[PDB]
Write a protein that binds this ligand. Structure first.
Ligand SMILES: [Mg+2]
Ligand SMILES: [Mg+2]
Ligand SMILES: [Mg+2]
Ligand SMILES: [Mg+2]
Ligand SMILES: [Mg+2]
Length: 224
RNA sequence: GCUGUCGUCAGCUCGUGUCGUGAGAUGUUGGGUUAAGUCCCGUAACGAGCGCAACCCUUGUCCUUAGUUACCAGCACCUCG
């Protein structure tokens, strides 16, 4: 908002200049002291475009999936996708979560009924020898499948925090053919992302800026 | 039908997904660890089956029930078994 919250924290920064993607050359305002700088005055209209798109998609009972698996960004998306509904992923993305949803449906069922088992009133009233194993399986399943426990159907649109690190999700999203929102850094590619956000990554303040923007956008959208 | 052998070695495969024009490949590679494809972590793979392990028999400790044809600590007799 108003070119100052983003200009303050970390948004006007890039990944040096040695590792830059030619297709970002149109978004570079300059390279001060060997580091690329993003043209924020161009980011604002498309940032607001993404905000208004997700806001108008909120009304209509559509589900928006968030992807944030990264160092120091998983917990932010975990807590921030909390409330306002919507699923998320907070740890390693599983290959085939979209193109092979039938298989992961079984894992979802296993997670649900094992959660019921371990929280039925302490069903495991027996030796801890295999109860520890059961709890370990529970936490292992949670750590990768907690965010998508709901949403029996495929998401109508998807949100990304970084496109280089999780290219696989975007690839299979285009293969399924659904809209995608992505934060494209200076060493990334606009290929496969529909609504581009030429923002910044690896800076925390920027990432909660992005995710709060999205979350209160969907809040003001789904009110009806 | 039954049996030997590699070999009681730890391997051999499938569904769905993905990569390749295809034969095919990933799963099943990698860092550790284990008797073991055993387990953990990572990881375009996610799961499953036959194997490994476990359930069977026996051996080593104790407890309950049992005391004849088995036993003899105590009591007595004893021809001293
Ligand atoms: Mg093909
Ligand atoms: Mg193979
Ligand atoms: Mg093999
Ligand atoms: Mg096994
Ligand atoms: Mg065996």
């Amino acid at each position: 908002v108003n070119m100052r919250d983003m200009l303050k924290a970390g948004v006007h920064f890039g990944h040096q200049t040695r590792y830059w993607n030619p297709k970002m050359g149109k978004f570079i305002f300059g390279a001060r002291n060997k580091i690329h700088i993003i043209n924020l005055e161009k980011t604002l209209p498309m940032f607001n475009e993404a905000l208004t798109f997700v806001e108008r998609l909120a009304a209509g009972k559509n589900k928006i999936l968030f992807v944030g698996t990264k160092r120091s960004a998983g917990k932010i998306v975990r807590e921030e996708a909390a409330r306002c509904g919507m699923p998320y992923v907070d740890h390693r993305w599983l290959g085939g979560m979209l193109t092979n949803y039938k298989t992961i449906r079984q894992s979802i069922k296993r997670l649900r009924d094992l959660e019921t088992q371990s929280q039925d009133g302490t069903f495991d009233k027996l030796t801890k020898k295999e109860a520890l194993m059961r709890s370990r399986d529970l936490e292992k399943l949670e750590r990768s499948l907690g965010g998508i426990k709901d949403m029996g159907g495929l998401p109508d649109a998807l949100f990304v925090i970084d496109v280089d690190h999780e290219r696989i999700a975007i690839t299979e999203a285009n293969k399924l053919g659904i809209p995608v929102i992505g934060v494209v850094d200076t060493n990334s590619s606009p290929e496969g992302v529909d609504y581009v956000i030429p923002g910044n990554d690896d800076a925390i303040r920027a990432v909660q800026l992005y995710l709060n923007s999205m979350a209160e956008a969907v809040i003001r959208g789904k009110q009806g």
